[PDB]
Each structure stands twice: as C-alpha cells, then as structure tokens.
Amino acid sequence: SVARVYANVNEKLGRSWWDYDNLVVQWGVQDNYEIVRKVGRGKYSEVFESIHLPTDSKCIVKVLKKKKKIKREIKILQNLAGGPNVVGLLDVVRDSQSKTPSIVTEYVNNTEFKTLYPKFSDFDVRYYIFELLKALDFCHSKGIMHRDVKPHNVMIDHEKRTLRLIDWGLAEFYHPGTEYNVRVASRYFKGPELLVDFQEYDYSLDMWSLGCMFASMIFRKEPFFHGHDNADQLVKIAKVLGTDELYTYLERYDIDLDAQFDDILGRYPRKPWSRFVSSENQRYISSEAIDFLDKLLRYDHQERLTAEEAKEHPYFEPVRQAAA
Numbered sequence: 001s002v003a004r005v006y007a008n009v010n011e012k013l014g015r016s017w018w019d020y021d022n023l024v025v026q027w028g029v030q031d032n033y034e035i036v037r038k039v040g041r042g043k044y045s046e047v048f049e050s051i052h053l054p055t056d057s058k059c060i061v062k063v064l065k066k067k068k069k070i071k072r073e074i075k076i077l078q079n080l081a082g083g084p085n086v087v088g089l090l091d092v093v094r095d096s097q098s099k100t101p102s103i104v105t106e107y108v109n110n111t112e113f114k115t116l117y118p119k120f121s122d123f124d125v126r127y128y129i130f131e132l133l134k135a136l137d138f139c140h141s142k143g144i145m146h147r148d149v150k151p152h153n154v155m156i157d158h159e160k161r162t163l164r165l166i167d168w169g170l171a172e173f174y175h176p177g178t179e180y181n182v183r184v185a186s187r188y189f190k191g192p193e194l195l196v197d198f199q200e201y202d203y204s205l206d207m208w209s210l211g212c213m214f215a216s217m218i219f220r221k222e223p224f225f226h227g228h229d230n231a232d233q234l235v236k237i238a239k240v241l242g243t244d245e246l247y248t249y250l251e252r253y254d255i256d257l258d259a260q261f262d263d264i265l266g267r268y269p270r271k272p273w274s275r276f277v278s279s280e281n282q283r284y285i286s287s288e289a290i291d292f293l294d295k296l297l298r299y300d301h302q303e304r305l306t307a308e309e310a311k312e313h314p315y316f317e318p319v320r321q322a323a324a
C-alpha cells in the first residue's frame, strides 16, 4: 500500500525536511517566559497559560517528557509554519540544568467540545469541518500525518469563528512503504487499519478519524463508535459498516484477523446511515451530509476522500458561497 496522493512530497523536499533525528534546535531564552496557570495535563505534556514577558502577551507553554519524539514534534511545527488553521509555534525553550524542553505556542480561546458541539447549527458544522480540512490538506501536502485527529485536538474559538489543529506529538512524516506503529490515535478514532495491525497506512488515517468526529456532530452521539477495548472497537465498527465489506477488505490487503475475533465477531448486515437519524439530531441531517460521511467511513483507506477531494463535496457549497 502507498498513498494515492502526496506520496513523493518527502522525496522532493529531501533530508532537511524530514530528518528530525539531526534537528539542531536554536533554543530561546527560558527567563523570557513566565508561567501563570496550568490549563491541562496530557499523557505526554503539561500545558500552562503563560506570558511572554518582553511583550506581556498571552501564550501557552507545553512541557514535554525518547529524545527522537521531541525532535519530531518540533521539526513538524517548524515545517508547518504559516499553514491555515495549524497551531502557531512561538518558541522552544528548556531548563538550564534539567534540560527539560518546552514548546511555546499561541493561546486559543477554546470552548470544550461536549459544551460547544450541541450549540452548533448545520452551517456551523459545515464551516468548522471545512476549516479542519484546510489544516489536514495543508499538512498532508507537506508529507505529514497528524494521527490523533479528535475533538480534544481541535480548538475552536466560536466568537472569533477560528480553528486550530493542535498536539502534533503523534504526527509523522509519510514515506512510501514504511511500516508505521499502529498504537496511535485514541481508541474511538482509530481506523480499521490500526485495529487489524495493517502498518503500511498513510494520510487517509486522518480522514477516518475526521469521519468519526463528523458522525459525532451530525448524529449527536459522542463517541460514535463506543468500544471497550481495541477488539470491541472493531466489532462496533463492523456492526455499522457490515462484515461483508470487512472480509473483502481483508482479502484485498491480505490481512488475516487475530484468532480471538472468531468468538466475538459475528455476521452483521450494513446498518444504513438513515437508521441513526432522530428528532434531536435531524437539524444536522441532509442527503449531502450522509454522502460525505459515507465517503470518509470506509474500511479500505484507499476508498476514502482526500482532504482536497472532501473540500469540493456539495456539503461544503453553503460554505464556499458564504466566502464570496
């Protein structure tokens, strides 16, 4: 398997674009930042609201815990500089003694998605998904997969109507035929390729994750596919897409399933998208939304829309018009 778009981007841009092992960071002055308030903690980071003291301006300091992965995240954030709806890198600093690095990013006025998403209109969903598609089409066009696309990593200032894709700590460069680690993404947003241990994945992983997110929004069910473990996650997906399309996909990519799917995985017919429509979510539902969702949520990553193809979908016509 090789990506159907942007496969040769890292080839064309060469070693100085993707070789993060040999990154030399020009560290900023740590005493130029003051930390004010912790805003959050991750598996990999603490995040604090802070001040850039020379300018007295609001910013974020992300303190990070292998060295390899710090360099990857920094090199990606430098390469993505200037890109639409990508979180802006302000600096990289570290402790004088301990050498613990921190990434300094722009501050965003987020509304938590459990609160924000239900307040959305149909146009709002169309608009923010379109804004997210600009960020993903940008990073894919630069040889980079995000690999952790989920609502926590999409920051929305609903007053400014502005969007930022954050947390590039799982992101990687795409190299044709590379076998990538499948333990990426949070469980609810993992593509089938991660769940059957198909390692030769590409940018199209982000598009499955986008699909899950989009299903949450239009069907008002967070998360859409609610599995308990990685095994059950594939069962929840199979109970919607069906097992017929699953077996053709496995056959097509020569994937053999783990032995202990045979007890838990039954034969399920395809549930139509229409069966998820209710009184409460009908506000979001149109024939264009379902068709768009259908073209993102495919077993076969090579059948999913590209971010670019997705921007031309009729679903986004109210948004292209409103921008003229």
Ligand SMILES: O=C(O)c1ccc2c(c1)nc(Nc1cccc(Cl)c1)c1ccncc12
Residues within 6 Å of the ligand: 039, 040, 041, 042, 045, 046, 047, 060, 062, 087, 105, 106, 107, 108, 109, 110, 155, 166, 167, 168
């Ligand atoms: O990782 C980044 O690149 C990254 C970049 C920017 C923010 C962030 C993470 N996390 C934020 N908040 C947050 C909220 C809950 C949990 C956690 Cl760990 C963090 C946040 C807030 C305000 N503006 C920018 C950010």
